[PDB]
Amino acid sequence: SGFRKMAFPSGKVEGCMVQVTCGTTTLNGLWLDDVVYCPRHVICTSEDMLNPNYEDLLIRKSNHNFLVQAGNVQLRVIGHSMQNCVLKLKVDTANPKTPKYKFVRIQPGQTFSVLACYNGSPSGVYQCAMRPNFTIKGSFLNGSCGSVGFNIDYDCVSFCYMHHMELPTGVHAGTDLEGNFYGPFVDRQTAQAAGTDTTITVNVLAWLYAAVINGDRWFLNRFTTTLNDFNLVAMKYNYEPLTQDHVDILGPLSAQTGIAVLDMCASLKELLQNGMNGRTILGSALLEDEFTPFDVVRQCSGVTF
């Protein structure tokens, strides 16, 4: 037993990380087949980043201006293009460590692992949730851009995120691997505000199931409720509405534990109205919303890749 925030094993993605240097700027790139994907602001100087005209900066770059290194080996760039906010650098060598992969764009409330990298080398791995306001609570320093987030399904790596920037509130923003930002953010050094965030209700319920499975059962009460009455109570606490799709997604957990979804909703309604009263759940004094139903099932049934 035990329940921990846990990231996917990262080796499949470690074998794809390279360093991308243009002039004086260096960041990370993702090397898949014979293409390196990286944030387009690698072509910026310090002065350009306040309001860059990326199309203009890219015209004055040729293939040889991009120094791509995989460990101690230079990869010769033989082509380049821009796709929204990412650059694609064609190289003369296909990555022999290319895993089976997909590019996906995730929905708010879904989680992924981030492999944080500097200079093309891995530094660490941690789990993140795409917030309803399209930000993530990461840990990124200078040079971390091009670090990617991903999920794994058996042998297939689904890349969903590439890191571009930090917001004044401390949170982080990036793009899918087609270079389209999550959220209303742009890749320039200017103050940008995230929308007001919301608590991912279905993830809180998943976490409460995780808690019951791991012995923490004091918050369960004898009542049921209806979706309508639960959503009425939870709206005032800035919880996103719980849909019937969300209930259906929680179905297998409710079947495994034998606690109906609307009974757990009754328990969460009581927790929202009365607080925890000093008690903890899975060690936390706060309700946690960064575990999806699938993360709970994954960890509590031992799914491997």
Ligand X SMILES: *C(=N)[C@H](C[C@@H]1CCNC1=O)NC(=O)[C@@H](CC(C)C)NC(=O)c1ccc(-c2ccc(F)cc2)cc1
- Residue 286 binds which of its own copies, ligand X, none (CB < 5-8 A, kind-dependent): its own copies
The residue within the footprint of its own copies, chosen from 32, 115, 194, 250 (CB under 8 A), is 115
The residue within the footprint of its own copies, chosen from 71, 79, 124, 184 (CB under 8 A), is 124
Q: Which is nearer to ligand X, 80 or 164 (CB)?
A: 164
- Residue 165 binds which of its own copies, ligand X, none (CB < 5-8 A, kind-dependent): ligand X
The residue within the footprint of its own copies, chosen from 196, 228, 277, 301 (CB under 8 A), is 301
Q: Does 130 bind its own copies (CB under 8 A)?
A: no
Q: Do residues 42 and 87 lie in contact, with contact meaning Cβ atoms separated by under 8 Å?
A: yes
Strands 156-166 and 101-103 come out as parallel
Q: Does 214 bind its own copies (CB under 8 A)?
A: yes
Closest separation in Å from C-beta 30 to its own copies: 15
Q: In the numeric block, which tokens belong to residue 296?
A: 């709970």
Catalytic residues: 41, 145
Instruction: Tell me how far apart the alpha carbons of residues 251 and 304 are, in angstroms, rounded to a whole number.
Output: 22
Instruction: Tell me how far apart the alpha carbons of residues 138 and 26 are, in angstroms, rounded to a whole number.
Output: 20
Stretch 15-74 residues interacting with its own copies (CB under 8 A):
15
> Cα 26 vs. chain centroid, distance in angstroms?
23
Q: Does 99 bind its own copies (CB under 8 A)?
A: no
Q: In the numeric block, which tokens belong to residue 211?
A: 């808690």
The residue within the footprint of its own copies, chosen from 45, 63, 107, 121 (CB under 8 A), is 121
- Residue 278 binds which of ligand X, its own copies, none (CB < 5-8 A, kind-dependent): none
Q: Which is nearer to its own copies, 100 or 137 (CB)?
A: 137
Q: Do residues 143 and 26 lie in contact, with contact meaning Cβ atoms separated by under 8 Å?
A: yes
Closest separation in Å from C-beta 259 to its own copies: 20
Q: How many CB atoms lie within 10 A of CB 192?
A: 16
Interface residues with ligand X (CB under 6 A) are 27, 41, 49, 140-145, 164-166, 168, 172, 187-191
In Å, how far are 124, 148, 200 from 138, measured between CA atoms?
A: 11, 11, 17
Closest separation in Å from C-beta 305 to ligand X: 19
CA angle (9 as vertex; 7, 11 as ends), nearest 5:
140
Closest separation in Å from C-beta 56 to ligand X: 15
- Is residue 267 exposed (0-12), middle (13-18) or buried (19+ Cβ within 10 Å)? buried
Short-list 117, 114, 103, 95, CA closest to 31? 95
Q: In the numeric block, which tokens belong to residue 140?
A: 């990124």
The residue within the footprint of its own copies, chosen from 112, 132, 166, 234 (CB under 8 A), is 166
Which of helix, strand or coil describes residue 167? coil
- Residue 49 binds which of ligand X, its own copies, none (CB < 5-8 A, kind-dependent): ligand X
Q: Which residues bind its own copies (CB under 8 A)?
A: 1-12, 14-15, 115-119, 121-126, 137-144, 166, 170-172, 214-215, 283, 285-286, 298-305
